[PDB]
A paper describes a structure:
In this TRC, nsP3 has been for a long time the least understood nsP, but recent studies revealed some of its functions in viral replication. nsP3 is organised into three domains: a macro domain (MD) at the N-terminal, a zinc-binding domain (ZBD) and a C-terminal hypervariable region (HVR). Macro domains can recognize ADP-ribose (ADPr), poly-ADP-ribose (PAR) in their free or protein-bound form, or O-acetyl-ADP-ribose (OAADPr). In order to better understand this mechanism, we initiated a structure-based study of the Getah virus (GETV) macro domain, which shows a peculiar substitution for one of the most conserved residues in the catalytic loop, namely serine replacing a glycine in position 30. We produced the GETV macro domain for crystallographic studies, alone or in complex with ADP-ribose, and documented several conformations adopted by ADP-ribose in the binding site.
Finally, we obtained a last GETV macro domain/ADP-ribose complex by co-crystallizing the protein with 3 mM ADP-ribose and 3 mM aspartic acid and diffraction data were collected to 1.45 Å resolution. For no apparent reason the space group in this complex changed from P212121 (as observed in all the previously described structures) to C2 and only one molecule is present in the asymmetric unit. The interactions between GETV macro domain and the adenine moiety, the proximal ribose and the phosphate groups of ADP-ribose are specular to the interactions observed in all the GETV macro domain/ADP-ribose complexes described so far. Lastly, co-crystallization of GETV macro domain with low concentrations of ADP-ribose and aspartic acid (3 mM each) led to a structure where the distal ribose is covalently attached to Cys34. This covalent thio-hemiacetal adduct is reminiscent of the keto-amine transition states involving a lysine residue described for DraG32 and Targ138. This structural rearrangement of the catalytic loop is conceivably due to a positional shift of the distal ribose chain with respect to open ribose in the single open conformation, implying a rotation of the of about 100° around the 3″-C and 2″-C bond. In the covalent complex the hydrogen bonds between 4″-OH and the side-chain of Thr113 and the main-chain of Asp31, as well as the one between 3″-OH and the side-chain of Asn24 are still maintained. However the interaction between 3″-OH and the side-chain of Ser30 is lost, and therefore the interaction between ADP-ribose and GETV macro domain is loosened. Due to the rearrangement of the open ADP-ribose chain the 2″-OH hydroxyl group now interacts with the main-chain of Cys34 and the 1″-OH group coordinates a water molecule.
Residue numbers in the entry: -1 to 160
């Protein structure tokens, strides 16, 4: 049985070479400022019926891509403990979609680290919940980010796991 693998890329997630992509979504399924701007531009039909509650994920095949809309919590709107539970739940929802649909690779941004961060640095919080959830899969996971300081912190965390 294959073990999951983790890499990090500092690049626009819309250019990924994986079988599926995770959109860091909002619950209403709206295309707004965030990862979803790039996902909507690349796969413009992938948002139809995408609305899904916080802490859940919803998949669509559209425009030749598998898009997984995962709704992390907005840390401005929940307590820290409640958001930590919901963030873990959103990544377990992604992992369940990966395993049940036999998806072999996935491009993933860090949920709740931008628009939904409550103005805090949540890179390691979000990454550690990504590892816990995606460890239940056999997928090749590629984490996407824009920030050089994030890219280093993510690679360091991946390296430790070895
Ligand atoms: C629309 O669905 C929109 O994405 C949502 O309403 C929110 O923006 C989601 O908020 P969240 O905090 O979960 O994530 P977001 O700020 O969108 O992005 C997470 C993380 O990813 C980096 N980022 C943003 N855009 C990209 C692209 N195109 N490629 C790689 N990485 C990207 C941000 O820096 C952010 O930290």
């Amino acid at each position: 049985m294959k073990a999951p693998s983790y890499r990090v890329r500092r690049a626009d997630i819309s250019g990924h070479g994986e079988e599926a992509v995770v959109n860091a979504a909002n619950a209403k399924g709206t295309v707004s400022d965030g990862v979803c701007r790039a996902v909507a531009k690349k796969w413009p039909s992938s948002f139809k019926g995408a609305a899904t509650p916080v802490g859940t994920a919803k998949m669509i095949r559209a425009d030749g891509m598998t898009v997984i809309h995962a709704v992390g919590p907005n840390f401005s709107t929940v307590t820290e403990a409640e958001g930590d539970r919901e963030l873990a739940a959103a990544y377990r929802a992604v992992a369940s979609i990966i395993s049940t649909n036999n998806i072999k690779s996935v491009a993933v941004p860090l949920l709740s680290t931008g628009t939904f961060s409550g103005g805090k640095d949540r890179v390691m919080q979000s990454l550690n919940h990504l590892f816990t959830a995606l460890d239940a899969t056999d997928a090749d996971v590629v984490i996407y980010c824009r920030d050089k300081n994030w890219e280093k912190k993510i690679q360091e965390a991946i390296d430790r796991r070895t």
